[PDB]
Design a binder for this molecule. Structure first.
Ligand SMILES: O=c1[nH]c(=O)c2nn[nH]c2[nH]1
Ligand SMILES: O=c1[nH]c(=O)c2nn[nH]c2[nH]1
Ligand SMILES: O=c1[nH]c(=O)c2nn[nH]c2[nH]1
Ligand SMILES: O=c1[nH]c(=O)c2nn[nH]c2[nH]1
Lengths: 303, 303, 303, 303
């Protein structure tokens, strides 16, 4: 392995071209993105055989400074005329490989830095502000893109995936976990009604990479829509395990978005421990945080 | 000083009595809390001269185990019949001092663990779910309550305050910071139009402690309403500094809630550094994260 | 309340004047600091009645920018000719009040950024490096100073406190917790031999604030020495509780350092849960992390 | 992809069999580990075609609960008679596959939870304590193991890797970064003498997997020795870049440990910004923390 690059390249752009013209699904009211405020955290990695002597000899002649990569990303966010993080990464990657012919490969990660609408009273009524935004530390969209310069000096995308990270959902009832192996290592009781609390990271892969860029936005798959499918399916399903739930979310994703090839789940179990099971004259219960160990599930659903 | 207790006592209750009958303000559509899911993180501290020998002699005869304090809090969340974190703390404090007559003082902090509504498609339409909630890592309500046993064995509340923590608001334009001292220590440029990014922690103190408990809910001041005042005032104001902004927020809070005695602000400046000031054929700009040092301001507004 | 300032002012100085001539104690090998690398994280808070209109009117005429306070601190670390964080805070505070006559109060917190020695080999010989240091995320020294301008324009230190933060100590045996109250809320079993794991924050005040500066190093109390007292007392003591332990550490500190007036403890209990109590042909056991709730103790010992 | 498992399985063992007889090297006096306290954080991932219906149908018949995997790991730490994390992982993997015939693949990560010796006094004689240890949040050893069940039912280790994570080293002088590309994106000044601050994660692979277990300690490569090579090479080298440094560290490791096949580096650049470059009558300078973006390098050196 031989790579180097820059991480935590934060870049905030105001008034990016809005995303509109998206194709709706029943689970989601998502209709586009205003892009008054557009934030991204970019990681860039680059490689190529011509970088060998920067390691073996300390010769920096062909080294693009990682600081310069940061400048490159921030300048290109200013000049970017598209509407998606996915398209931004393609713009950076193509531009970078064109600038630096001795670089053979570039890998990019982009994480949305999300902001939420706020409201203000002016001129007699309360309405969504065009100026004030709330920074959100909850779920955020992601994008991945790698590009290579082939031996004949043409450029090709070699990896492209989009995702949703940091989704934390708890369903207070309508979940069971029963029937698992009960042997000398088992102390978990069967539970026919648990408050299942899952963390979800979901990544999808398009059949056609162009669909991820937003150039024809009807073919784009928005993280907001994926989020709304996850919450709807969770609600609809009498879950039998996290494994069972994520398969059903993946099936719904692929049914709603036939232009997707596959979807990959990383889930974690953070379900609370029960403290009080019965409250006089009430349907309520009391729970608390568990010990640190957490379950996880990794599963790919394919079209 | 001589205190001991328990921190990070997480407790989650389902179907707490709903909060309704609140009094509305123009800045906020807040109308109550469903309380299907109610989460709190409690810190408890206790003191009293009769605890001295637990330190000086290792005599535990009068020590309530901190583990037992955790049990006490969790069991009392199950039996609490009220509607606010503030009222829950009063319930815990009164019950604890009544149980342990050798304790002279108890101090409680309660932090909301907030959850957000999600939506699902069922029976033909998309609607808010009564089952699935999204855990939020953004702003959260807080409550503080201390109680003492007086020499005559009566009980009195000695401190009570409510608050809103973790509010992070950025206003993309309509903010200046000019006219400050420019001397041999100054390298900050004057800025007539900055994207002010503030973190806000807001704490309010009622004239009458009973108004914080929700027993007469029309007198309650909800953190949600405070949040909406902050975003509205930020939007409305051509800010001249963070100092200027928080004074105006405080004035609006005290105008909207005449039952409050005072409001206290802790603010932090996290405004981004500018990278690209002019983008062709666009009003947008590009910013990035600053170095770690952050400004802060602390100010009390009184009725 | 009315203050503002700057937090997370990191400043790293190479080749500060070495701290020499400190009085050693039997518990610690500490004899000074080479100060090849000296790191501090400073927080500065300033107040004064003349700051009022910066809040109430948006008037910035008397506003020292918080950015300028950062410059002030970093420049004064370059010009500081002393040998301790405590003395550095005094230098900054005096300098700041002499510079800005409208400031009536300044509060400073200084936290050591600790580095540990590393070893290197030169012509076969292994010895401590004078060039390479390891950044430590473990315990660190602290200092606090509050200075006021009196009506007659003299400057007075009204509060001074030094400390050690982030010390995490586990004693595998020789600890008990028995004899505490057992009632309807008590599930904690009595334990005659637990692996007590405590977090310690230890703060001390001098009888004479001048002794904190290091000008007469024989009177200076080093956080390193406090660390080694704490571990030695923990080792020696068959502890009966954390309360019992911290009182005994405090007594030993005050015996070793008669120039101190008080020692204040903030401790937390993070003792592991036992999983396997008996291992064949072994004295060992297996433990794991507990649930999040943690006990804490707060206690002052006075000279 | 189809796996599931358990993360953050903390397990602490007292009086593990000591590691002794480790061959020393010039750069390190390390010869073994007393193992009075042995802490590990384990992540376990398992797979197998027979797990399919646990996802596709919600059938839990062949689901080992992740909670039971936690119990399995903690119980096996109690019964483990070896001396290394690498060997512990082999013990867990082999035992798990022997127990659960439907599992075809197991992947394990083990991270040391490191503790440091402390001082205690006995009759004025200061010595290392056999009871009190300091929990360290600095660098720590790692181990990785993947084991598969073949069609002929033999068990085979397909990947094994050891490592050191979290090493943070700063060298105050004797580092340059010059001669890199200067074009339209370059603003970084050349620096002939910078205080290079690197984060290092170092991983190695053995020619023979059996050498990683420690059964013959003379063939075992300890993370502590790798740590000491890294600090020594950093000191000795007039570095020309991080790339240059990590190649030289890798070469030294492979020279000292001919039983290793490769060393893999993940480094990060966290070098401070210079604030004051000249201090009168002093060689010192003042630096501060940079903006968030960080450089990184990834590189494999082979035997
Ligand atoms: O949904 C679940 N899947 C699992 O594999 C599991 N193991 N313990 N609890 C669990 N819950
Ligand atoms: O609003 C602000 N107040 C301040 O005091 C300040 N100092 N630097 N920037 C600032 N912005
Ligand atoms: O040392 C202790 N002090 C306490 O107060 C306590 N409570 N539970 N466990 C405890 N341990
Ligand atoms: O050691 C370094 N390598 C790099 O690639 C680099 N880029 N900017 N600074 C740097 N320092």
């Amino acid at each position: 392995v031989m790579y180097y690059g820059k991480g935590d390249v934060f870049a905030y752009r105001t008034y990016l071209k809005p995303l509109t013209g998206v194709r709706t699904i029943p689970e989601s009211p998502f209709s586009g993105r205003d892009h008054i405020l557009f934030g991204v955290n970019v990681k860039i990695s680059v490689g190529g055989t011509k970088l060998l002597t920067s390691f073996t000899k300390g010769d920096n002649s062909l080294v693009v400074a990682t600081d310069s990569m940061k400048n490159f990303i921030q300048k290109h966010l200013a000049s970017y005329t598209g509407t998606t993080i996915e398209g931004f990464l393609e713009y950076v990657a193509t531009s970078f490989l064109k600038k630096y012919s001795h670089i053979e490969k570039i890998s990019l990660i982009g994480e949305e830095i999300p902001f939420e609408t706020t409201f203000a009273v002016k001129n007699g009524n309360r309405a969504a502000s065009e100026l004030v935004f709330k920074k959100s530390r909850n779920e955020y969209a992601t994008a991945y893109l790698n590009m290579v310069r082939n031996e004949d000096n043409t450029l090709n995308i070699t990896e492209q995936q989009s995702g949703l990270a940091g989704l934390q959902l708890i369903k207070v009832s309508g979940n069971s976990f029963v029937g698992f192996i009960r042997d000398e290592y088992t102390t978990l009781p069967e539970d026919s009604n648990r408050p299942l609390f899952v963390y979800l990271n979901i990544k999808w892969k398009y059949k056609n990479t162009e669909d991820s860029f937003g150039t024809n936005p009807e073919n784009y798959v928005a993280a907001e829509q994926i989020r709304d499918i996850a919450t709807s399916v969770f609600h609809e399903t009498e879950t039998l395990s996290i494994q069972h739930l994520i398969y059903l979310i993946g099936r719904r994703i692929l049914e709603r978005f036939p232009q997707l090839q596959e979807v990959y789940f990383e889930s974690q179990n953070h379900t609370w421990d029960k403290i009080v099971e019965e409250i006089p004259e009430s349907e309520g219960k009391v729970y608390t945080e568990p010990r640190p160990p957490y379950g996880f599930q990794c599963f790919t659903v394919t079209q």
